[PDB]
Structure formats: structure tokens, C-alpha cells
Design a protein around this ligand. Structure first.
Ligand SMILES: CC1=N[C@@H]2[C@@H](O)[C@H](O[C@@H]3O[C@H](CO[C@H]4O[C@H](CO)[C@@H](O)[C@H](O)[C@@H]4O)[C@@H](O)[C@H](O[C@H]4O[C@H](CO)[C@@H](O)[C@H](O)[C@@H]4O)[C@@H]3O)[C@@H](CO)O[C@@H]2S1
Ligand SMILES: CC1=N[C@@H]2[C@@H](O)[C@H](O[C@@H]3O[C@H](CO[C@H]4O[C@H](CO)[C@@H](O)[C@H](O)[C@@H]4O)[C@@H](O)[C@H](O[C@H]4O[C@H](CO)[C@@H](O)[C@H](O)[C@@H]4O)[C@@H]3O)[C@@H](CO)O[C@@H]2S1
Lengths: 601, 599
């Protein structure tokens, strides 16, 4: 039923002749959210080291084809929220039936970028048993007299146009001779020479020097020529196959090659069993020694795909990325699954003012504006996913639980729920964010919450022990309480952490929903109605995207008030069925100040 | 004489009808060096604070017109080297006779960017006494039914295409009414709404709310609408005029406006007297409490324009930016001119591996490759200016002096000279760089020097968080220069926060070092080069090509290979061709590619 723009995918011959200017969908697939530079690490877990990196190969979209460019009316969508333990994201996709070169969709590029995570697209040369064809490989490996590889040029051009950070190269098609192998090496090297600074090409350990498919599970003499060859750099990293018990040898070989052992990502296959995946952790993270290499997670989206509901999906992600403890700071290294927080510092991109979050998880059963439902429809749009709490979860005192709620929202479709038993006079704190926010005059702390039992919600901030204080100026907005705490008295200081605290009352119960937290007015959007060629009877709204803007909201007038029908963090939005009606487009600033609405007939 | 591409400059009606695709010179005026993000500050001066910023309005080129796009065969050029005390650089230019909208030339954009300094172009509405015309102002302020300002669009387009970071707006043309004033405010507001993130529009404290020209010398009720109007942002900063004795009031007013006092730049006019400029420093930097606002330096290029020689120019810049002490760490706050180091931390963009410097100052009397002269001609090309020492100069022990030398070079036209008396058995160190360089396996320290008296030159590195002085591991001789390599694998996972050198005196009692390369950290593919017409000059041509620090163009002669051109962009204009050429690409590590041959 969906006739809108779709995220792209290609077989090599379609890519060759692909031009953004001629692709009706290309403008919808561009990310307009740059990779946030300079994340800051936390230090709450004593066992976590600073050397090892982590890549995730995640099916952020279950399918390669049929993915709407910019979100969809579906609550249950893969709203991964553990960007903070991730150094590199690989968009897992590609199939013999749909296309083997697949960039990440723009919604996911955006989510990744807000958390300063570089995201790679996938070039998937499938095993013949899965419809793999040598032809496709040979096509990609075509070389001009020039020496250049035209399809490599297309990889770079796609990554440049759509706005992501490189490619994962997965060569599992059998039948390749040694000449093909050398050509692949030339192809990867050509990538290195031509790519923009920062771009990352990650090679899967599969095709060896002979062209045979022969996973090494380590960096060996059989595969090292795909990472580094003497003084020539071939690839930025290698994802090691799963069948290893120890990685010391790869570390040693990497040093002999003059490369960091941490450009090797020891692979762990978690697709089927997630946290029940058996792993020789000592083989990667030895006892008094630093990590032998980095870590590669194949398919953490297990959490999504083995679950039926958003809540079970979110619980499995916590258990997987943080561990059975539910506390990043208190991990059980003796557990079968200690969790990623056991080994990896959490990073935060809350490093710049203004810092704003509405605890938007990226989807919802409903959409709220200033605490009022403005659409009752399921939606996902991971471009609207906020930077979520560094820690999941760190509390002190009370018998409380913290989770995301999709029942209450102030902006978007979720809130942070903090609820349970808190005895009278008892104090509880929840430390949420590692940060690096320079305070200057005019800088305020605001936050917005509901409280079912009337307890007030204090804010907590840590300066370069948390300071817990109550807000200065209170305001009521559709049932929500918004505090503003001026921080002028602290100008010149730097906030390195954000938190909340509450005091129990006679009730003995606490139930908070917090829908905005921030440390820190756009022009009405200039909007044009254009054809979306592939769908007459549909249209697209196109504006000039302002850098002061977090995203755009499209309302349509109804007999029952204004209804939200669209959101975009790009420069356009496709609306179906319009040819067949008054619209209102507002731009919301980074601080979520709404502009005056442009009217469109 | 020179018929090559020239740095641009417009009156408003020329800008209106400008499009890059039709300008033969536009491609030569594009910067290909992005603004380096994330500089790191030093801590060596106890009095320096972290709040106040500093803008320089510098005539990096003496003239608006006649500026070659990419360097010129002139040694004495304004090779400003104090980017480290500068937060914002404004390219000072514009005149009634030449053009009043002028972007920075590509060479200067590049130098600025390498040091992570945002550089602004100039929009100069001149006083009528200087040929100013209200017309030009009215032209710039034209508004469509749309509400948009077409010439503002051209300012943003120029900045985008050429690769710089905004504009300084200088409105000193008399005769403007209150309507013009409001239009200017709308123009500045339109800029804010349309500009790319990061871009900076700085407004001069001149035209007040009535449109009259009435410098306030402070942020007042008469000019605040040009910075901020309620919740609307009008400009990113204001450069306050010079006639102030104190700035507390502007600080206070800025707070009431909900803006940082440090978006205000208290102006100091140093054009005529440089370090002899009288300043009420206490009025800006109160003996305790913070600085009231930021600092605005009008014309530090006094150092260049009041001097006749590179050496005198370089000495005056030291005396101006560092002080009479010659030591950023030991400043005399009681001096008439304590120097900028007295108040401002030095920043460094040595924050990423590979870090490479050849101590190229941007010009030379001569050009060297691997220590051999490959051209005897004066040159300047500030696209080749390296990130130069954070500290000028910090030494311990000996009776030594450090300066730049244009007599000895390993790559380019200059080296760092460290020379004087060092008694046998004595030690001396010179701390050169504040850095932030993650060490990983495969990472080496290299350095390259000549020593007139045979002392060896040790490298110094400080780890996060006293320097480690060690001697190199592998020695190499290259055309009279010694190159040490010191593997740093034993330190992988550590971070270098500082680089230095150290020497031990010998029986000679003398030391004379010239150091031409220092680096913490693969040869490029031969450039794919085409010969194209440079339309405005038949009998001239341009080489155009598509990792790489810069390109070198050699021509074959009866006397060997001669360097005739360098470019950090995608092309170079060569005059007189009409002859075998050789184009090599040099990597960031200065590994040369195989030369493309061109006939
Ligand atoms: C890097 C790495 N690359 C391989 C990775 O490809 C491999 O993955 C597995 O991939 C199987 C094949 O996928 C392709 O072909 C399928 C059928 O035509 C398509 O549906 C698919 O989208 C691809 O184009 C895949 O079928 C595997 O899934 C099956 O087994 C799983 C257990 O591992 C299970 O969880 C599934 O639900 C399913 O039955 C699988 O994801 C991995 C693992 O073998 O190794 C390297 S890592
Ligand atoms: C921001 C700030 N803007 C003004 C700034 O413009 C002003 O500068 C002075 O500017 C004078 C006028 O310059 C223009 O007109 C000249 C003549 O047609 C041109 O040659 C020029 O390039 C411009 O288009 C200028 O003449 C002043 O220089 C003279 O006095 C100097 C002392 O300040 C002296 O050092 C010179 O050698 C010369 O005789 C001067 O640079 C400043 C200072 O008044 O105020 C604000 S800051």
C-alpha cells in the first residue's frame, strides 16, 4: 500500500548507472544530521578499558527492500538505543533477491550521527547457496585503463551524497581465482586512496589470498594482505570470523604489520541466542593484560527480532548491552554474559550547548506536542531519536525502577519512567548522563515531568558528587511541570553529568515521567508543493533546511483539531493521497521552539 | 607583469552577477583545507584565562586587488604565525577604489584553517571621506517580495564556494536613515537564518539604531539591536570601537540581553604603533574577577607593515603576541605591553595523527626538497605554512636563542634555528608543542636537523599527563641532514601532550641546530593531470588534477630539475609555457608520489 520514496539498494549494474539527480528517491535518502564529533567517555565501570573498540553489524531494518525513506506508521521498529557502547555501526543488509549494495536509510544514519557513531553501508557478496553470483563480484571489480574502479567511485559517491561514513565489504561468493583476489585488494586500496578523510572501509575476514573462501577467524598470513601490505593500507579494519578461542596471535601479527590490534574486530555471532551466546571472553579480554583486539558483534538486533513487543525488545537490549545487573557500574564479570558495559566505557555526545533531550526513543504508539496527543497513530522515525541516558540504569536509594514509557510523552512518543516505592523522607537519585557542557551566562537547566504521587522532581548536575537542587521557576503545561534553573552562578564551570532526585512522601510511592531535560525561534519554513513523480496522487513538501532546526512537523486540519501527519529532519516529506486540505508546517529549533506555521493549500 | 588568477573582490553590483562557473579565477580561489576542529589549549601562563576570546582584523594582504590566487615569487609577504593566540581571523580588506566585499585569499584561508582558526571575509562600507557611497549600502540591502536579500545570499554562496567561515560587516557610510538601519538589522537577521552551522557574522560597533554613524565603544542601547533583539539573534559578535576605558557596563548589558559578554570584542587600534599602543588593560582584564569581554585587535599586521625585513617582521610579531620577555610562560603583567600570552592560552591543532611539521613559515628566499635547494627564487605560499611551535619560546639551560631561519631548510624555505653557547656537559631543552596525539603501534617519532658543532639533537615528548628526553633509534643521512626515527610502540595506548628537543654541550661550547622536520606518525598515486586553457591569459596554462598535502611542479632544465610551482588545491597557473613538466603529489607525511610527466 505504500507508494512513497524507498531507501536504496543496488546490484552492481544498477549502481553503475545510478545518478542522484535522476533518482526520485535520492533526495529523501540523504541524511541531514552530520556525525557528531568528540564523544566523551564515562568511567563508572572499573573493569572497562579504553583500548578495545566495538562494531555492531545490525539489521536496523529487517529487510533490504521496501524500507520507507523517512519513517513509517509502525511502532514496532528497530529503535536501537545503545549507540553509547558502539564505536562503529554497520548497517546489515543485502541479498541475492533484493540487491547486494545497500546504504543505511536516512533515519538510521541520523540516529547514529547524533550519537557520534560512524555508520557504514553494506556490500554483500553472498554465498552461492544464498544466490550469490561471481558475476556481481566481477562487475564491482571492473577496472579502467585509468586504473580506477568505476563502482568503487559509486560507493564513495553514494556515501558522500547520502551522508554516511564508508562501507563493510563482505566477500563470500565462491569461485574466485587468485586474480580476483588481487583485484579485490586493488579495489580496497583504490578506496583508501580516493575516500574522504574519516571514511571507514571494513573488510570481513573471508576471501583469502588465493580467492578461496576460507574464514581465518584471526588475522593471518592468509588474509593480512586485505588489511595492510607492507606500507600500503588496504583497509581500515577487519571483522574476524567467529571460530576463535584466543586472539593473542592476531594482536602479535597486527603489531608486526605496524597496525593497531584494535583495527581487528573479533567477531561474535549473537544472531540466534543474543545473551545466551557462548563466548570465550578471556580469549579476547585477558586478566591482567589489555584486550588482544577489538570486538565485533554480528546481529545485536537479535533483541528486536526475537521479540514481539517494544518492551521485551528494550529489556533484551538492556540485558545484552548492560548485563543481568541492570547497572553499568556493577557488572558481573563471572556471568556467562557480563554485558558490553563490563568491557566498554559508555560514550556520550552531550558535549555541546544547547543539550536537549525529550527521551524520544524513535518510535511511539502516539505522538505528543507539549504534552498533548496530536496523533494517535503508531509511528517510527529514528531521525527523532534523542541522545538517551548514558547509564541504564544507575540509581541510589528507594525501591525504584527506571525504563522508557510509551504511555506518556511531552514531545514525541516516549518518556523516561521512574517509578516504584519511596518511603517518606527517603531520598533517591538516578544518574542519567555523562556530559561536557560549558556553562555560560544565559545558560539554564530545564526539565519537564509528571508526578503521579505529587513528589517534586529535583535536577542533578555534576561539575568538573552531584549537586541536587530544586528548580527556580515552575510552569504548568498540559499536566506537565516544567522547572527552569538558571546556572549563571556557575558560568565558567563545566557540567560533566546530569541526574534527577526525589524525596518520598506519606504516599510511600513514586511515579515520575520525564519528557524533557535541557541545558541551554525559527522562521516559518519556506515550503513548496512538488510532484513525487512515482506517485501521482501523492505529493512532496520541499523546504530549505535551516541549521537552526531539529525537525519539521506537518499538521493537517480536521473537524477534530490539528492532527500531526508527518515529521522530517531533512528538507522534504512525502505525503500520500493528497491529490484527492489545509496543511501547517512548523520548524522546531534545537531547543524545540516552534516557528510560526507556514500555511499550504 | 602578472597575468594569473587573482583573489576576488566586488562592489555590490558585480557580486550580484557573480557565479563561479563563469569566473575563470573562482577555482583558484577555493580553499582545499578544511577548518581543523578541536584545538587544545596550553597551560604555561598562570595569568591567562579561558573565558576571553580574541579576533584579529589583519591585512594578511596589503592590497585588496592584484593578489595572486595561490602565492607569488615574493619572500617578504605577511606570513602571520600567531594563529595560536587567535580565536577568529578577519581578513582586512576593501576600498572605494577596488571593491568593498572581499573574501580571504585561498592561501590565507588554508593557513588559518590548519590552525583551526575560522576566517572571515570583509564587507567594508567606507566612510564618505574615503569614497564611501550610500548607494553600495542600499544595493546590499535590497529585499525581494520573498523577504530574502539576494546579496546576503551571495555572501553565503561565496563563503561556501571559496571555503571560509563568515563575514565581518563594517558599516561606516554616512547618510543612512532609520529605515536603512532597520533594513541592515533585517539583513543581519536573514544571514543568521540562512547561514550554515558554524558560520560567523561579526558586526562593527558603528551604525546605531537611527542609522547615524556613532561608535559607542561599548555595547549600549544604541547598538544592541545589531547583536540581539529580544529572542532574535542578529549577529554572532560585535567588534567594539576603540574609545573605551572600561568594559564592565558592556558585560552587564550583554548578560541582560542573555548573551555572553565574550561575544563582544573590545577593540584596540594597533595599526600605527603596535606594541607602543597605549591600552587600559585593567579596563578589559580586571586584576581579579574575569575579563569583562573578549579582545579585538585592529591591524596586528603592523608588525609586517612597519618592517622592511622578514626578520624584523618576525621579531615584532613575537614582541607583540608574546611580549618583551620572549617567553609565553614568563610574562610581565606590569609592562605597557604584556603581550597576548599574558591573557590568552595558546591553542594547538596538533591533535591528530599523523602530526607533521617542517617549520615552513609560508615564505622563503629559496625552496628545498629533502635538504637540497630545488629553486633559488623567493616564494610565498601560505598554503604551505606548517603548524608552528605553540611556544615562542620556552627553553631551559644554556645561553641559546631560538628563531626561524631562512638560510637552512629541509622541506620548503625555513627551519627552526636553535643556537648559541652551550658549555660542555650541560643540558638544554626547548619545549615546542602542546599536543594531543594518541600513540598506537606503528607510530614513530621522526625529526630532522643539521648540527654545526656536531652535538646530537634529542627529541622530547610529554605523556598525558615533565618531558621524556631520549635519543633516536635509527639514524639516516639525507643531503647533510640527520633524520632520527624513534619507535613509540612501547607507549601504545598513551597520549603525547607535548613535543620538545634537548641537547648536550660539548667541548666546542657552542650549539647551532637547524631543525627542518618533526613528526608523529605510503606513497600517493601519481596525480592525474590535465593541461587546460587559462582563458584570461593565452600563452599561459593551468594544470588541473583531482590524502595529499600539496603538489609540486618541476620543470626540466639544463641544470637539473627546478621547482616552479606548488599548490594545495586542485590546479596551478603557470605563465610562459609556450618544455617537460613533472607533477608529484606529497602525502601528509611528505612521501612523494611518482611524478606524472606532462609535455
Ligand atoms: C560479516 C559476516 N558475514 C557472514 C554473515 O552473512 C552470516 O550470516 C548469516 O547469513 C545467512 C545468509 O544471508 C543471506 O541469504 C539469506 C537467504 O537467501 C537472506 O535471507 C539474507 O538476508 C542474506 O542475503 C542467514 O540466512 C543466516 O540467518 C539464518 O541463520 C541464523 C543463525 O546464524 C538465524 O539467526 C536466522 O534467523 C536464519 O535462519 C545468518 O544471519 C554470519 C553467520 O553465519 O557469518 C558471517 S558474519
Ligand atoms: C572594524 C574597523 N573599521 C574601522 C577601520 O576602517 C578604521 O581604519 C582606518 O581605515 C582608514 C580608511 O581605510 C579605507 O580608505 C583608505 C583611503 O581611501 C584606503 O587606503 C583603505 O585601504 C580603506 O579602503 C585608513 O586610511 C586608516 O589608515 C590611516 O591611518 C592609520 C591610523 O589608524 C595609519 O596606521 C595608516 O598608515 C593610515 O594613514 C586606518 O587603517 C579603524 C581606525 O580608524 O577604525 C575602525 S576598526
Amino acid at each position: 500500500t505504500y507508494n512513497g520514496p524507498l531507501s536504496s539498494h543496488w546490484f552492481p549494474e544498477e549502481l553503475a548507472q545510478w545518478e542522484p539527480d535522476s533518482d526520485p528517491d535520492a533526495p529523501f535518502n540523504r541524511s541531514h544530521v552530520p556525525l557528531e564529533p568528540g564523544r566523551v567517555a564515562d568511567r563508572v565501570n572499573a573493569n572497562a578499558d579504553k583500548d578495545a573498540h566495538l562494531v555492531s553489524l545490525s539489521a536496523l531494518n529487517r529487510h533490504t527492500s521496501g524500507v520507507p525513506s523517512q519513517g513509517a506508521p509502525v511502532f514496532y521498529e528497530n529503535t536501537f538505543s545503545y549507540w553509547h557502547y558502539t564505536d562503529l555501526m554497520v548497517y546489515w543488509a543485502g541479498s541475492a533477491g533484493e540487491g547486494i549494495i545497500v546504504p543505511p536509510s536516512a533515519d538510521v544514519i541520523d540516529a547514529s550521527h547524533r550519537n557520534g557513531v560512524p555508520i557504514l553501508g553494506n556490500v554483500f557478496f553472498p554465498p552461492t547457496v544464498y544466490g550469490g553470483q561471481l558475476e556481481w563480484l566481477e562487475q564491482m571489480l571492473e577496472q579502467e585503463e585509468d586504473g580506477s574502479f568505476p563502482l568503487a567511485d559509486k560507493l564513495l559517491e553514494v556515501a558522500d551524497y547520502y551522508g554516511f561514513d564508508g562501507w563493510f565489504i563482505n566477500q563470500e561468493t565462491e569461485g574466485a581465482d587468485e586474480g580476483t583476489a588481487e583485484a579485490m585488494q586493488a579495489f580496497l586500496v583504490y578506496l583508501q586512496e580516493q575516500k574522504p578523510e574519516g571514511m571507514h572501509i571494513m573488510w570481513y575476514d573471508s576471501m583469502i589470498d588465493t580467492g578461496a573462501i576460507a574464514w581465518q577467524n584471526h588475522l593471518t598470513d592468509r588474509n593480512k594482505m586485505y588489511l595492510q601490505n607492507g606500507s600500503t593500507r588496504v583497509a581500515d579494519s577487519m571483522f574476524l570470523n567467529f571460530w576463535w578461542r584466543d586472539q593473542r596471535q592476531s594482536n602479535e601479527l597486527a603489531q608486526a604489520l605496524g597496525r593497531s590490534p584494535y583495527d581487528l574486530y573479533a567477531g561474535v555471532d549473537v544472531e540466534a541466542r543474543g545473551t545466551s551466546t557462548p563466548v570465550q571472553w578471556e580469549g579476547l579480554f585477558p586478566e591482567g593484560e589489555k584486550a588482544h583486539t577489538s570486538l565485533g558483534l554480528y546481529r545485536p538486533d537479535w533483541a528486536f527480532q526475537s521479540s514481539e513487543t517494544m518492551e521485551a525488545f528494550y529489556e533484551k537490549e538492556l540485558q545484552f548491552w548492560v548485563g543481568s545487573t541492570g547497572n553499568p557500574a556493577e557488572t558481573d564479570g563471572q556471568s556467562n554474559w557480563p554485558g558490553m558495559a563490563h568491557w566498554f566505557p559508555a560514550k556520550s555526545t552531550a558535549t555541546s550547548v544547547p543539550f536537549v533531550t525529550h527521551f524520544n526513543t524513535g518510535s511511539g504508539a502516539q505522538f505528543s506536542a507539549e504534552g498533548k496527543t496530536v496523533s494517535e497513530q503508531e509511528w517510527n522515525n529514528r531521525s527523532l531519536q534523542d541522545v538517551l541516558p548514558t547509564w541504564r540504569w544507575i540509581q541510589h536509594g528507594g525501591d525504584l525502577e527506571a525504563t522508557f514509557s510509551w504511555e506518556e510523552a511531552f514531545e514525541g512518543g516516549s518518556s523516561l519512567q521512574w517509578h516504584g516505592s519511596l518511603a517518606e523522607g527517603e531520598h533517591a537519585q538516578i544518574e542519567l548522563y555523562q556530559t561536557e557542557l560549558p556553562i555560560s551566562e544565559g545558560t539554564s537547566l530545564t526539565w519537564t515531568f509528571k508526578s503521579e504521587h505529587d513528589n517534586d522532581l529535583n535536577v542533578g548536575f555534576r561539575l568538573d558528587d552531584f549537586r541536587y537542587v530544586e528548580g527556580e521557576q515552575r510552569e504548568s503545561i498540559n499536566g506537565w511541570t516544567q522547572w527552569t534553573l538558571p546556572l549563571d552562578a556557575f558560568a565558567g564551570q563545566t557540567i560533566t553529568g546530569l541526574a534527577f532526585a526525589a524525596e518520598g512522601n506519606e504516599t510511600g510511592l513514586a511515579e515520575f515521567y520525564t519528557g524533557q531535560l535541557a541545558v541551554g525561534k525559527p522562521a516559518a519554513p519556506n515550503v513548496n508543493v512538488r510532484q513525487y513523480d512515482p506517485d501521482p496522487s501523492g505529493i512532496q513538501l520541499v523546504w530549505e533546511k535551516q541549521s537552526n532546526v531539529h525537525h519539521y512537523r506537518v499538521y493537517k486540519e480536521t473537524k477534530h483539531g490539528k492532527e500531526l501527519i508527518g515529521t522530517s529532519a531533512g528538507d522534504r516529506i512525502y505525503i500520500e493521497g493528497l491529490v484527492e486540505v489545509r496543511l501547517h508546517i512548523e520548524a522546531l529549533s534545537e531547543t524545540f521552539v516552534p516557528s510560526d506555521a507556514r500555511m499550504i493549500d
